[PDB]
Amino acid sequence: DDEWLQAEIARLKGKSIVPLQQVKTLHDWLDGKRKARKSCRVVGESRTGKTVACDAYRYRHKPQQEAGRPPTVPVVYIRPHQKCGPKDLFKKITEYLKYRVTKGTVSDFRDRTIEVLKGCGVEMLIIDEADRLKPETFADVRDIAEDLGIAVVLVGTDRLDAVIKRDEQVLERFRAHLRFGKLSGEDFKNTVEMWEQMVLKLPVSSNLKSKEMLRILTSATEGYIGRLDEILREAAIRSLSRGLKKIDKAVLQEVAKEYK
Amino acid sequence: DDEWLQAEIARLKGKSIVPLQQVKTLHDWLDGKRKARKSCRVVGESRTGKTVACDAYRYRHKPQQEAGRPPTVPVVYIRPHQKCGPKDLFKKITEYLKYRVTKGTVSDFRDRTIEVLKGCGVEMLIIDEADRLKPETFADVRDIAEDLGIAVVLVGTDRLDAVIKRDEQVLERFRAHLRFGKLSGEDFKNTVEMWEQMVLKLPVSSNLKSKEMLRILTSATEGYIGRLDEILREAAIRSLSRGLKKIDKAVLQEVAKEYK
Amino acid sequence: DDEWLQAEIARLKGKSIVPLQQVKTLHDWLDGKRKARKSCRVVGESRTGKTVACDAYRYRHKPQQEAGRPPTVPVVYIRPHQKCGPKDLFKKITEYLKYRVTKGTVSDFRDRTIEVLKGCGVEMLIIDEADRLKPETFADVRDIAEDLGIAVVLVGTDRLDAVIKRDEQVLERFRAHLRFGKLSGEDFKNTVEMWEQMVLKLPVSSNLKSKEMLRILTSATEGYIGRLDEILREAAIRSLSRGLKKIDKAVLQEVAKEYK
Amino acid sequence: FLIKPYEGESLSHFLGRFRRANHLSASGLGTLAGIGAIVARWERFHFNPRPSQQELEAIASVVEVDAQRLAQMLPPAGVGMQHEPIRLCGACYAESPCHRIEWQYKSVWKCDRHQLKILAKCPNCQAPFKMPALWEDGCCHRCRMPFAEMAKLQK
Amino acid sequence: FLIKPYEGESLSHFLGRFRRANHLSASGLGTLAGIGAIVARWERFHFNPRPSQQELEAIASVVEVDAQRLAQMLPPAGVGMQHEPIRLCGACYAESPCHRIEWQYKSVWKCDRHQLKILAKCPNCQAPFKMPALWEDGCCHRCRMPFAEMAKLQK
DNA sequence: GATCGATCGATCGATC
DNA sequence: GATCGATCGATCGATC
Ligand SMILES: Nc1ncnc2c1ncn2[C@@H]1O[C@H](COP(=O)(O)OP(=O)(O)OP(=O)(O)O)[C@@H](O)[C@H]1O
Ligand SMILES: Nc1ncnc2c1ncn2[C@@H]1O[C@H](COP(=O)(O)OP(=O)(O)OP(=O)(O)O)[C@@H](O)[C@H]1O
Ligand SMILES: Nc1ncnc2c1ncn2[C@@H]1O[C@H](COP(=O)(O)OP(=O)(O)OP(=O)(O)O)[C@@H](O)[C@H]1O
Ligand SMILES: [Mg+2]
Ligand SMILES: [Mg+2]
Ligand SMILES: [Mg+2]
Ligand SMILES: [Zn+2]
Ligand SMILES: [Zn+2]
């Protein structure tokens, strides 16, 4: 049973991807923008679930490689680090395509990245956390989208909109957006129940997400998917650590007051 | 039974929304002003029940959000704090729409608020306690109602009328009003009985709001819905604390003399 | 006896770690967050005893090294200096793991730090004085906690909460907290007596922390553990310097008035 | 507002002149072109990482001057230049109001056209010239002597 | 962090791989070994003063690979090599991720194991390969094609 | 019922 | 990146 407990805590520590309507709308919109090479910018709140949805859109088109030609990668997903320069961004582009870089100038990196970007037939350039990179690199991404005809999606918090607003071309070129919703409503309750069935993966104790539990989780998460995930995982782990088979009211109260 | 007593006292502490003719007239008038984008100003006494009715008109049109576009919020309800400046008001507008602010000048806040206000397709701007904000902000709300075509309802006590009277444009532009009534009469008795049935939620002991009880409550509340709510809740809690199943005459006498 | 006096003054100058309920709650919470890789932020007052408790949680898991593989360090404790940049922080991370840095760019330091951080199997990243580092480094710590799955605890004064509040992602991601208490009460008296027995390490003269002494120490420390330690050590050293075997009333009065 | 380059005009001078015609900061031009801080680097004649084809084409798209013509605002391959001191032939400036990239060539000390030593600071007050992108008017920023009049003090 | 050499691995490739495992610059490895700038010379395949016994033993002390084994990361006596172009068999790299010193032998144009011409630049984008010490990942630094995938384009 | 004058206190905003 | 920089905004209170 101790081995089972370790397996349960390890599984609860690891996060999963429950496909819900938010990510469904997102990759539908992404496919629509991809079929037309339309460069947009998906925006949303923090800790709301944009990175996971972009990740899912990345894995669904797992590149299928030919026997002797470069693997064709339709969707490129990048999350450049803080104050990412042009050399760093190009390094990341050519590294995701599995082309190790060669020491050289910024022009050399640009040329190699362009070569490998046309070579693999890339369709999408998903730049998550697009509020980190310097504005001397937005010209480079503009040139990529202009000449190579690759639909670029700039992903980030609402601060990304402020970052691009002070610029001139990047704001006009990247204007289509898809704001991530708050999810509050009956769909939120559906989310809680679906999470209970799938992610918790606990024996059926008929918790059913009663009205009191819904009120507690509404007061706790404030609509955030990430907060919901964190609270659910913390409550499950705390119940399993103290021997409780299911999740009681005291643990939700404890985790809710610990958050707020 | 002690758990039941705790549930009863917790429920009695929490306030509810009984829909009566006052709020019915109010949201009928609000719908009429909304269908024409007519900016009015609902006025009334203090502790009479305007905030709750505006709140009900806010929740009835719960925003329905699209899969990937901003939620469309038809009614915006705000209650700016004391001496609310223009930056504070704009912060509140864009915060209710769930767009977290970015540090910047007053012009930046104004531009972002205008952008998010046209983005969500807002129809109503309900400014409760509209006697708090500075007169350098009435120009901003005037500009909002002028250019964005959003019917603004200025809610507040009769002091709001004096505040707007000393100004020139805000008085002429916001002239339609709906004064909240005193409710005294047979409709007041209907209110007492309806409150007894719904809000008190006590076992039927045939209190029936007899003539003596009506006289006591008339002498106590002076027509105020808020005073009626406070007196009823205090009497119920005092009866339940001393073991009395129903509400006696002594508790109404005690709460009435404690008020006046 | 002079050698004994020198030993006593040297011991009194050196600080110790008395394990009390504050640090017990703290490392219990830290173990709970570690078993789930949950990144939190322990907050508290100044001169209250958070650094010592985090230090104790660091030494309890003293890394056990294999014969020929890197030592596995489960808990990493850092206290970055004022205005700590990303390069400085990465230098500190790889220096604690006993990997001396090599001259290079910020990207080189980041890559080496990531390599050594996955190599040693680190579970915790305890950033004490987390109100010092620049906000261009919070993106780096966010990336660490996001990709390497290491629970980060941001430790600092209440100013750290203000520092993270103006940011967007770091506030949402790091929301679980453990405020350090004031300790005032009977537990405070237990603290005084326990300190007298252990830290003072003086011959039993039946001081017993009488009511007058408790009143003086309450007026002096205001609940701070650090102030209690400083006052006790100063009084002991002053008594031992003037030949007094035990601690008199005059020395507490002198140190109390010297503080306030 | 588009501008035609002057013959021999340096990249720094041209970029600043384009920015002045459009009320743009260096960061603003960088965002318009999608290359950010690179614009300001080029304006100060910093090219340790030499201008790439993609960067030149990005600027070319905004200013509507081909990358090949932009490359003629820099020294040819193998010709060393200096970011400092910024230099000037006043007699040239009187004929065409621009800084010439040739004046930053390490091998150049005399104007061939005018057979005069080129200037490394104002000959009236000794103030060094700013980077050419900041040559807003044709005068010394300190004493206000016109660059064209400095021709009379060239040796 | 110590690393076992791959069979046939060149000295440049091995030195860079050791440096990456230890987050060392070439100058840093040189100071650790007490020989300074010699490390970077060897990484670029420059051996005007061939590696001395003392220099090989100095590096051997740090990397814990005997000088005799380090000498097998260079051509045998009498075998001429070239510092340029850096070459690659992608089919070999797929089996063992290193640059082989044999690929710099002047007499070598074909991989004997795979019976393929060895590559002197990326066959996808024509970018030359960097010195082997800088082969941080197994991909072309320009187009990002994996060296292992270049096997499919070898002739 | 004007009225006059002191006062201090956030506060955003340019700016070097 | 603090550092001013007015500044106006009540406000209030006696007082004649
Ligand atoms: N489709 C999903 N299925 C499961 N969990 C999800 C999903 N979408 C989001 N999450 C949860 O959301 C949290 C993080 O979300 P994500 O990283 O995508 O945020 P984001 O919207 O990109 O925001 P940020 O910019 O603040 O990082 C995690 O707890 C993750 O489990
Ligand atoms: N429709 C209603 N149903 C139930 N209670 C109501 C209703 N309308 C008002 N109340 C009661 O009135 C009290 C407060 O009313 P509300 O806050 O709306 O006042 P208001 O008229 O806006 O006045 P004020 O400006 O003085 O706050 C509460 O006790 C609340 O329960
Ligand atoms: N568990 C403990 N045992 C003994 N002394 C302690 C303990 N906790 C704190 N102290 C005392 O507290 C003082 C400093 O505490 P600490 O450095 O941990 O503070 P902190 O809460 O992190 O605050 P700050 O951020 O202001 O430095 C010292 O005098 C130290 O002896
Ligand atoms: Mg994210
Ligand atoms: Mg009200
Ligand atoms: Mg401390
Ligand atoms: Zn000339
Ligand atoms: Zn081969």
The backbone torsions φ and ψ at residue B237, rounded to the nearest 5 degrees and listed phi first, read -65, -40
Report, in angstroms and rounded to the nearest whole number, the Rg of chain A calculated over CA atoms.
22
Quote the distance between the C-alpha of residue A158 and its chain's center. 15
Å from CA of B157 to ligand 5 middle: 7
Q: Tokens for B255?
A: 């709460």
Q: Do D30 and A139 touch (CB under 8 A)?
A: yes
* Gap between the terminal Cα atoms of chain B: 34
Q: Tokens for D84?
A: 């400092």
Q: Which helix (H) or strand (E) holds A158?
A: helix A158-165
How close B184 comes to chain A (CA, Å)? 37
Establish whether B229 is an annotated binding residue. Answer: yes
Residue among D79, D69, D16 nearest D47 (CA):
D79
Q: Which long-range contacts (CB under 8 A, 24 or more apart) does C146-151 make?
A: C148/C114, C148/C117, C148/C118, C148/C122, C149/C37, C150/C37, C150/C39, C150/C76, C150/C117, C150/C122, C150/C123, C150/C124, C150/C125, C151/C33, C151/C34, C151/C36, C151/C37, C151/C38, C151/C39, C151/C40, C151/C123, C151/C124, C151/C125
Residue B185, helix vs strand vs coil:
coil
Q: With contact defined as beta carbons under 8 Å apart, do B117 and B98 qualify?
A: no
Q: How many CB atoms lie within 10 A of CB A214?
A: 14
Q: Do C104 and E27 touch (CB under 8 A)?
A: no
Q: Tokens for B218?
A: 């008339």
Chains that touch C (3 or more CB pairs under 8 A): A, E
Q: With contact defined as beta carbons under 8 Å apart, do C34 and C145 qualify?
A: no
Quote the distance between the C-alpha of residue C222 and its chain's center. 19
Beta carbons within 8 Å of D90's beta carbon, 6+ residues apart:
D119, D147, D148, D149, D150, D151, D152, D153, D154
The backbone torsions φ and ψ at residue C165, rounded to the nearest 5 degrees and listed phi first, read -65, -40
Residue among E90, C105, E130 nearest A109 (CA):
E130
Å from CA of A198 to ligand 6 middle: 42
**Strand ranges (E), chain A:** 75-78, 124-127, 151-154
Helix%, strand%, coil% for chain B, nearest 5: 55, 5, 40
Residue among E34, E31, E25, E155 nearest E90 (CA):
E155
Strand partners, A77: A126
Residue among E101, E49, E93, E46 nearest E71 (CA):
E101
Query: What DSSP assignment string belongs to D71-129?
Result: HTTSPPTT--B-SSS--B-HHHHHHS-S-BGGGGBTT--EETTTTEEPBSS-TTT-PPP
Reply yes or no: is the peptide bond before residue E85 cis, omega within 30 of 0. yes
Å from CA of E104 to ligand 3 middle: 62
Which of the nucleotides in strand F have any atom less than 7 Å away from a protein CB atom?
11-14
Q: How far is it, in rounded angstroms, from Cα E70 to Cα E10?
A: 9
The backbone torsions φ and ψ at residue C156, rounded to the nearest 5 degrees and listed phi first, read 170, 180
Q: Is the dihedral of CA B16, B19, B25, B30 positive or negative?
A: positive
Residues written for chain B = 260
Q: Which chain D residues contact residue A147 at CB under 8 A? A: 54, 57
**Strand ranges (E), chain B:** 75-78, 124-127, 151-154
- The secondary structure of residue D151, as a DSSP letter, is G
Residue A156, helix vs strand vs coil:
strand
- The secondary structure of residue A133, as a DSSP letter, is S
Residue A212, Cβ density class (10 Å: 0-12 exposed, 13-18 middle, ≥19 buried):
exposed
The backbone torsions φ and ψ at residue B6, rounded to the nearest 5 degrees and listed phi first, read -65, -40
Residues written for chain D = 155
Q: How many CB atoms lie within 10 A of CB A253?
A: 13
Residue identified by tokens 């590559």 is: E119
Q: With contact defined as beta carbons under 8 Å apart, do D128 and D120 qualify?
A: yes
Q: How far is it, in rounded angstroms, from Cα A151 to Cα D100?
A: 40
Is the backbone of residue D78 left (phi > 0), alpha (psi -120 to 50) or beta?
left
Beta carbons within 8 Å of D37's beta carbon, 6+ residues apart:
A134, A135, A136, D27, D30
Give the CA distances from residue B158 to residues B48, B176, D114, in Å, rounded to whole numbers and listed in that order. Answer: 12, 14, 84
Look at strands E116-117 and E110-111 and give their pairing: antiparallel
Look at strands A124-127 and A151-154 and give their pairing: parallel
Is the backbone of residue D115 left (phi > 0), alpha (psi -120 to 50) or beta?
left
Residue among E84, E83, E111 nearest E96 (CA):
E111
Strand partners, C126: C77, C153
Ligand whose nearest atom lies closest to the CA of E148? 8
Q: With contact defined as beta carbons under 8 Å apart, do E30 and E37 qualify?
A: yes
Residue D51, helix vs strand vs coil:
coil
Residue identified by tokens 């609902």 is: B42
Q: How far is it, in rounded angstroms, from Cα A15 to Cα A18?
A: 10
Q: How far is it, in rounded angstroms, from Cα B197 to Cα B199?
A: 6
Helices and strands counted in chain A (H then E):
12, 3
Residue among C56, C73, C51 nearest C130 (CA):
C51
Q: With contact defined as beta carbons under 8 Å apart, do B104 and B97 qualify?
A: no
Reply yes or no: is the peptide bond before residue B71 cis, omega within 30 of 0. no
- The secondary structure of residue E44, as a DSSP letter, is T
The backbone torsions φ and ψ at residue C125, rounded to the nearest 5 degrees and listed phi first, read -130, 95
Q: How far is it, in rounded angstroms, from Cα E155 to Cα E150?
A: 10
Q: For ligand 1, is residue A47 a contact (CB within 6 Å)? A: yes
Q: Which helix (H) or strand (E) holds C154?
A: strand C151-154
Q: How far is it, in rounded angstroms, from Cα C189 to Cα C198?
A: 14
Q: Does C158 touch chain E (CB under 8 A)?
A: no
Residue A126 corresponds to which amino acid? I
The backbone torsions φ and ψ at residue A24, rounded to the nearest 5 degrees and listed phi first, read -65, -50
Q: Do D34 and A140 touch (CB under 8 A)?
A: yes
Residue among A79, A117, A125, A114 nearest A97 (CA):
A117
Residue identified by tokens 């960088």 is: D30
**Which runs of consecutive H residues, i.e. helices, occur in C155-224?**
158-165, 169-173, 186-195, 211-221
Q: How far is it, in rounded angstroms, from Cα C92 to Cα C78?
A: 7
Q: Tokens for D112?
A: 């061939």
Q: How far is it, in rounded angstroms, from Cα C123 to Cα C58?
A: 11
Q: Which helix (H) or strand (E) holds C151?
A: strand C151-154
Q: Output b/e per residue, E89-114; b: 16+ Cβ within 10 A.
A: bbbbbbeebbbbbbbbbeebeebeeb
Q: Which of B68, B99, B104 sits opposite A29 (nearest CB)?
A: B68
Report, in angstroms and rounded to the nearest whole number, the Rg of chain D calculated over CA atoms.
15
Q: Which chain A residues contact residue C139 at CB under 8 A? A: 81-82, 129, 132
Q: With contact defined as beta carbons under 8 Å apart, do E138 and E146 qualify?
A: yes
Residue among B69, B162, B160 nearest B116 (CA):
B69
Q: With contact defined as beta carbons under 8 Å apart, do C86 and C136 qualify?
A: yes
Q: With contact defined as beta carbons under 8 Å apart, do A43 and A160 qualify?
A: yes
State the method.
cryo-EM
Give the CA distances from residue B205 to residues A67, B196, B200, B201, B247, in Å, rounded to whole numbers and listed in that order. Answer: 86, 11, 12, 11, 9
Q: Do D28 and A168 touch (CB under 8 A)?
A: yes
Q: Tokens for A10?
A: 């390890």
Give the CA distances from residue E5 to residues B166, C118, E99, in Å, rounded to whole numbers and listed in that order. Answer: 88, 23, 11
CA at B167, C1' at F1: how many angstroms apart? 22
Q: Tokens for D146?
A: 């016109």
Helices and strands counted in chain B (H then E):
12, 3
Residue C211, helix vs strand vs coil:
helix
Q: With contact defined as beta carbons under 8 Å apart, do D65 and D102 qualify?
A: no
**Best mutation site among A99, A105, A111 for testing chain E: the one with the most E CBs within 10 Å?**
A99
Q: Which chain E residues contact residue C70 at CB under 8 A? A: 1
Give the CA distances from residue B233 to residues B204, D122, E135, in Å, rounded to whole numbers and listed in that order. Answer: 17, 87, 78
Q: With contact defined as beta carbons under 8 Å apart, do D150 and D124 qualify?
A: yes
Q: Do B67 and A162 touch (CB under 8 A)?
A: no
Residue among E70, E62, E68 nearest E12 (CA):
E70
Q: How far is it, in rounded angstroms, from Cα B253 to Cα A139?
A: 78
Cα angle, residue B174 at apex, residues B168 and B176 outer, rounded to 5°: 135
CA at E27, C1' at G15: how many angstroms apart? 87
| Residue of the CA atom closest to atom 26 of ligand 2 | B46
Q: With contact defined as beta carbons under 8 Å apart, do E100 and E121 qualify?
A: no
The backbone torsions φ and ψ at residue E144, rounded to the nearest 5 degrees and listed phi first, read 75, 15
Give the CA distances from residue A69 to residues A90, D73, E150, in Å, rounded to whole numbers and listed in that order. Answer: 22, 41, 8
Q: Do C172 and A224 touch (CB under 8 A)?
A: yes
Q: How many CB atoms lie within 10 A of CB C259?
A: 14
Residue among A220, A151, A180, A201 nearest A50 (CA):
A180
Å from CA of D19 to ligand 7 middle: 25
**Strand ranges (E), chain E:** 110-111, 116-117
Q: How far is it, in rounded angstroms, from Cα E25 to Cα E2?
A: 16
Q: Which chain A residues contact residue B62 at CB under 8 A? A: 185
The backbone torsions φ and ψ at residue D75, rounded to the nearest 5 degrees and listed phi first, read -65, 150
Q: Is the dihedral of CA A158, A163, A166, A168 positive or negative?
A: negative
Cα angle, residue E144 at apex, residues E139 and E146 outer, rounded to 5°: 40
Q: For ligand 2, is residue B157 a contact (CB within 6 Å)? A: yes
Q: Tokens for A112?
A: 């190699």
Q: Tokens for C22?
A: 């504050």
Chains C and D touch (3+ CB pairs under 8 A): no
Strand partners, C127: C78, C154
Residue identified by tokens 């190599």 is: C119
Question: What resolution does the deposited structure have, in angstroms?
Answer: 3.4
Query: What DSSP assignment string belongs to E49-92?
Result: SPPPHHHHHHHHHHHT--HHHHHTTSPPTT--B-SSS--B-HHH
CA at B53, C1' at G8: how many angstroms apart? 38
